[PDB]
Design a protein around this ligand. Structure first.
Ligand SMILES: [Mg+2]
Length: 364
């Protein structure tokens, strides 16, 4: 009874369901001990932007190797979650461990009011490589939206809103990306790889190395708050909710409540407006020997309405080029009427749901 009743309850509440990634979506985590040193010093160039950072310790592996994780919350998070929770029932779905997810939830949602126990992790999701809507909503995905910095982990599902990856701890990636894409290995091997990765990050102190280099040459401060993604994301999520409920009112009323709206149809229609009419040819972006049309970049671009072509037989509108020294660049220039731009034109445009001026992304 539970699944079909939740759908009915959510419609009575006039809400949708939101699946929320943690790492590089709403937080950025590191184990570099440099952060604790900078936090301990009000005179440090980085201290002010670290004031909101929170930490916790976890014991990991069979030897109980212990690490202090430092968590930066993306700017505007508390307000974003409060406002979005009025419109969406929130879930966490992370590739981090259950213990990691619980520690993060204890800081972002101490009393449980935002997520309750709707926290899915590597321990219980069923895969260490891919995420699936069907783990939460096996029979009806029509009301669920995902926010995640990665499209590949969702196979570029139509219900995904890919977000700009949050990189506050400069040079630190995703501390929970160890097993993405891979086969399952023995726990023994997974634990060995995890501890190795964590030990490396602690021992190499990448934040210190980068900050030292800057000082040896805000401009000289490594860490900055310059991220406004949640403000943008809130607007997108509010629009999806409103379109859904307007369509739901229309469809259900005309069908005697037998048919309903579907965010998996709504979202592609919104995205397809962004690069509608663009026909993209890549040069030097996808590795030689790799299938272009199934690549992440091509799938991301096509989700926003771009066509992708592989040659000049029907001239593209844009040549997306990595290097100026290629025959594809020379040909596009010699042919005329084709915009030759850096990859950043595409990724920044897709990131902003807005086609940016090509003149800002010329190659040199
Ligand atoms: Mg992530």
């Amino acid at each position: 009874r539970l699944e079909s009743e939740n759908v009915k309850r959510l419609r009575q509440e006039k809400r949708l369901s939101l699946i929320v990634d943690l790492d590089q979506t709403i937080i950025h985590a590191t184990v570099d001990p440099t952060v604790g040193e900078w936090m301990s010093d009000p005179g440090n160039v980085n201290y002010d932007v670290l004031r909101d950072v929170r930490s916790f310790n976890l014991q990991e592996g069979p030897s109980g190797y212990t690490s202090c994780y430092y968590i930066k919350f993306r700017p505007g998070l508390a307000q974003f979650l409060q406002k979005i929770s009025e419109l969406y029932e929130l879930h966490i779905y992370t590739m981090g461990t259950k213990a990691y997810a619980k520690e993060v939830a204890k800081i972002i949602d101490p009393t449980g009011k935002l997520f309750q126990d709707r926290v899915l992790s590597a321990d219980d999701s069923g895969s260490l490589a891919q995420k699936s809507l069907r783990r939460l909503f096996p029979c009806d995905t029509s009301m669920v939206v995902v926010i995640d910095d990665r499209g590949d982990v969702w196979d570029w599902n139509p219900n995904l809103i890919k977000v700009v990856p949050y990189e506050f701890f400069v040079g630190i990636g995703d501390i929970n990306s160890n097993f993405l894409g891979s086969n399952r290995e023995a726990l023994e091997e997974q634990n060995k790889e995890r501890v190795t990765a964590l030990e490396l990050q602690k021992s190499e102190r990448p934040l210190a190395k980068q900050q030292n280099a800057l000082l040896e040459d805000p401009s000289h401060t490594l860490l900055h708050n310059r991220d406004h993604e949640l403000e943008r994301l809130e607007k997108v999520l509010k629009d999806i909710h409103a379109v859904y409920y307007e369509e739901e009112n229309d469809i259900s009323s005309r069908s005697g409540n037998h048919k309903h709206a579907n965010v998996g149809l709504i979202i592609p229609k919104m995205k397809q407006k962004v690069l509608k009419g663009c026909r993209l040819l890549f040069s030097g972006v996808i590795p030689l020997g790799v299938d272009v049309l199934s690549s992440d970049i091509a799938k991301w671009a096509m989700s926003f309405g771009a066509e992708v072509v592989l040659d000049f037989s029907v001239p593209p509108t844009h040549l997306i080029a990595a290097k100026i020294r290629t025959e594809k660049v020379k040909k596009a220039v010699s042919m005329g009427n084709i915009k030759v731009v850096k990859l950043n034109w595409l990724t920044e445009s897709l990131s902003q749901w807005k086609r940016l001026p090509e003149s800002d992304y010329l190659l040199y």
